[PDB]
Design a protein around this ligand. Structure first.
Ligand code: 3FR
Length: 261
């Protein structure tokens, strides 16, 4: 079943030209779509109705949309309206051309300390907006932290997001991200999936002695066994880690392959 070259919706009555392929997410396929009247570029999520044959699966997508649609923040991926034809459900989203923070990680390994400050700050500022509007992401990872042409972090993928465990699970996820950025490897990384959960439950990680004592102190608190003893989003911004060392306000595109100079 072919995805149409031109994507039109009954509501806005706008035409979207399906351009270059971008990737796939389980059952969804992403394409770079262009508004045929305004020439504005968007990331279009295309999901076939055969993937949502069961009404239960149709719930999770409508819940994700309801949460994402209400969101408006310079650090959250912009929602720009969803629609459907009989074959596919289309979600028009903000385009992030420099991929996610995952592709940067795999290419870079351990990033420099000032970079981590920039990336965490912008991510945490986005997480703050979510938590203020009573939204828990619940699945924060490097792949969800998208990057545009200005290297700005934009949080996306709200497939497990909820609106009101609570807020402190997002703090935990951010602790893993800060670890991975600074160390170069995930804190609970193992080839076996079953092992990873035992690693998480027993809280089995060890920050290598090479990491900044101030940075390791923040990571430990973010990954603390007691969820109530984890720092709040507001407390994260003001931590020594951000205030002590150099923190750039802009990063070059070179950071995708090489350390800044
Ligand atoms: C919003 C939104 N969602 N996606 C999106 C949508 C689906 Cl269905 C799949 C994937 C995806 C494909 C392969 C690996 C990983 C992923 C993933 N991050 O889940 C990504 C976007 C993609 C882009 N830019 C392109 C250049 C890009 C391609 C690959 C990775 C990152 C960015 N910009 C905004 C969005």
């Amino acid at each position: 079943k072919e995805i149409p070259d031109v994507l039109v919706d009954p509501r806005t009555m706008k035409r979207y030209m399906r351009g270059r392929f971008l990737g796939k997410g389980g059952f969804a396929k992403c394409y770079e779509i262009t508004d045929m009247d305004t020439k504005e570029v968007f990331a279009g999520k295309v999901v076939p109705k055969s993937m949502l044959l069961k009404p239960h699966q149709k719930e999770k997508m409508s819940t994700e949309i309801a949460i994402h649609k209400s969101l408006d923040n310079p650090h959250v991926v912009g929602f720009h309206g969803f629609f459907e034809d009989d074959d596919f459900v289309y979600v028009v989203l903000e385009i992030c051309r420099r991929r996610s923070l995952l592709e940067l990680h795999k290419r870079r390994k351990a990033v420099t300390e000032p970079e981590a400050r920039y990336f965490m700050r912008q991510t945490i500022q986005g997480v703050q907006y979510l938590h203020n509007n009573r939204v828990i992401h619940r699945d924060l990872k490097l792949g969800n932290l998208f990057l545009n042409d200005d290297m700005d972090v934009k949080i996306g993928d709200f497939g497990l997001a909820t609106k009101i465990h609570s807020f402190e699970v997002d703090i935990w996820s951010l602790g893993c991200i800060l670890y991975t950025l600074l160390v170069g490897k995930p804190p609970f990384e193992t080839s076996c999936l079953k092992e990873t959960y035992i690693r998480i439950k027993k809280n089995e990680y060890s920050v290598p002695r090479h990491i900044n004592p101030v940075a390791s102190a923040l990571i430990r608190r973010m990954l603390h066994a007691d969820p109530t003893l984890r720092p709040s989003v507001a407390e994260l911004l003001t931590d020594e880690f951000f205030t002590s060392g150099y923190a750039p306000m802009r990063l070059p595109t070179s950071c995708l392959t090489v350390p800044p100079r």
